[PDB]
Every structure is written in C-alpha cells, then in structure tokens.
Amino acid sequence: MQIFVKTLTGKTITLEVEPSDTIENVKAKIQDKEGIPPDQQRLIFAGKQLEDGRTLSDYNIQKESTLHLVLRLRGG
Amino acid sequence: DVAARQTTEMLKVMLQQGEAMRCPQCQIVVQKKDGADWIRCTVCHTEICWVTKGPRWGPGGPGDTSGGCRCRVNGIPCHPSCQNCH
Amino acid sequence: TTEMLKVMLQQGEAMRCPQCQIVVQKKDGADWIRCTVCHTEICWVTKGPRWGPGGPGDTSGGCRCRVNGIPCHPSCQNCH
Ligand SMILES: [Cl-]
Ligand SMILES: [Zn+2]
Ligand SMILES: [Zn+2]
Ligand SMILES: [Zn+2]
Ligand SMILES: [Zn+2]
Ligand SMILES: [Zn+2]
Ligand SMILES: [Zn+2]
C-alpha cells in the first residue's frame, strides 16, 4: 500500500509500505528517498509521535494515510 | 480526517511553546534537541537562530548581517537570553 | 563484466540514463555526470535528470537544485 509524508510546507512524499512495517523501517525508507538520517526524524500521526518499535498497524495507519515529518536537530 | 486535525493542533501547540518552528528558508518543521541557541537545517543548510526563532543570517549566508538576528552587531546580543547563536 | 554491471544496477552503483536509458556507472565523489552517449546532464545524487527537456537552465523539470535556495538533496555538494 501507499502512505504520504508531509515535509516542507505544501510538499508531500509517497512511500511504499506494508501494514506490518515498523516505524524504524519507515524512517529507513524516508532516508533512502530524501536523505534525512533516521535519528533526525520524528514522525507524527493523528497528533502522536510514533515510536520506532511499533508498526503502522499498531497506530491504525491505513492506505492513503498522511504522516508529518519533523526534523529533530542537535543544537550547535 | 480527525487525524489531520489532531496533528495540526499538536503542531500549533509546539510552535506556541517554542518547541518547534518552520525553517525560514525551506519551511520544514524543525525541533532543537539540546546544545546552544542555534541549529543548522538538514535540508537546506540554513543556520537558524533558535532564541529569536528566525534566520541567523541574511541571504549571503554566514557572515551576512544584512538580515537575520544580527547578534552582537554594534555589541548588542540578539536576545537577552542568548548564550551562543553562532 | 556484464554480470557485475547487472549487480551494480541492482545495488544502485549504476543507473539508466534518464534520456537515452543506457547504463551509466557512478562517478565516485561527483553529484553530476554527463552521459557519454547522449551527453545529457544527470543528477546522480537524486538519480534523475538534472534539467527539463529544454536543457541546461530549464527548471521546468529535473532536480531544480538551488531554486529558491533549496538544494536538490541534503547530501548534494554540487550537481552543477
Ligand atoms: Cl545561513
Ligand atoms: Zn531548511
Ligand atoms: Zn541570534
Ligand atoms: Zn544571539
Ligand atoms: Zn544518455
Ligand atoms: Zn541535483
Ligand atoms: Zn544538487
């Protein structure tokens, strides 16, 4: 199936996922497609930060759902 | 669709509390984890002044005080709580 | 050899030219490659055409690196 991830204002990427994929797996697909290290990624769905070990299923993320990507960066 | 609104509301709260902002160049949402009063955007490499929630520099990049927070120009910090925004 | 080339394509150490579809091997260090056959400009770091059909400068297609100050990819150093 497919899910969407909001990045820049107004911009979305599409990802190829399975209901059983974990959050760490999704962040790996984001890194492959967008070049953002997984340790910098925080994913949000329906107002909740997603935990690396749970799966799209646990969070009730279905086809055409939309996640929001936030960058978590270290201060200088 | 209740999902979308819950996420919009969460982001609104993050912005209001100062826990997140939009990168002023590329408009991705960024959060700062630890460290000093500045971060560099991963997407576009813009330096961001966290304590004023805005760009550190003008369009010429690092060194360009024609815009940005102008920390220490004429000796004046960009914010009274600034310790180091680069 | 052709067998190793098959694996490089499989593994992403090679790509097909976006204009002419011939196999293009990686130029280590470089974010840009000029195809040796059709001479089109390739953005290696995004694995796509550097430009639209109008050629160099045409940001109606391609990776649009540096438009509005935004690099085409966080790892890009210079894709021309
Ligand atoms: Cl900058
Ligand atoms: Zn940015
Ligand atoms: Zn500042
Ligand atoms: Zn400052
Ligand atoms: Zn070619
Ligand atoms: Zn490029
Ligand atoms: Zn580039």
Residue numbers in the entry:
A (entry chain C): 1 to 76
B (entry chain A): 425 to 510
C (entry chain B): 431 to 510
Manuscript excerpt for this entry:
HOIL-1 is a RING-between-RING-family E3 ubiquitin ligase and a component of the linear ubiquitin chain assembly complex. RBR E3 ubiquitin ligases like HOIL-1 catalyse ubiquitination in a two-step mechanism where ubiquitin is first transferred from the E2 active site Cys to the E3 active site Cys before being transferred to the substrate. Here, we show that HOIL-1 is unable to ubiquitinate lysine but can efficiently ubiquitinate serine and a variety of model and physiologically relevant di- and monosaccharides in vitro. We identify a critical catalytic histidine residue, His510, in the flexible catalytic site of HOIL-1 that enables this O-linked ubiquitination and prohibits ubiquitin discharge onto lysine sidechains.
First, we attempted to crystallise the HOIL-1 (C460A) RING2 domain with His-ubiquitin-maltose to obtain insights into how HOIL-1 may ubiquitinate maltose. We crystallised HOIL-1 RING/ubiquitin-maltose under the same conditions as HOIL-1 RING2/ubiquitin and successfully determined the X-ray structure to 1.7 Å resolution. As with the HOIL-1 RING2/ubiquitin structure, the crystallographic asymmetric unit contains two HOIL-1 RING2 molecules and one ubiquitin molecule bound in the donor ubiquitin site of one HOIL-1 RING2 domain. Although we can resolve the ubiquitin C terminus, we do not observe clear electron density for the ubiquitin-conjugated maltose molecule and therefore were unable to build the maltose molecule into the model, despite intact mass spectrometry confirming that the vast majority of the ubiquitin in crystals grown under identical conditions is conjugated to maltose. This suggests that maltose does not form specific stable interactions with the HOIL-1 RING2 domain, in line with the broad substrate specificity we observe for HOIL-1 in vitro. (D) Intact mass spectrometry analysis of redissolved crystals taken from two different crystallisation drops shows that most (>75%) of ubiquitin present in the crystals is conjugated to maltose. (A, B, C) Electron density maps of the ubiquitin C terminus (pink sticks; Gly76 modelled in two conformations, (A, B)) in the HOIL-1 (green sticks) active site lack clear density for the maltose molecule.
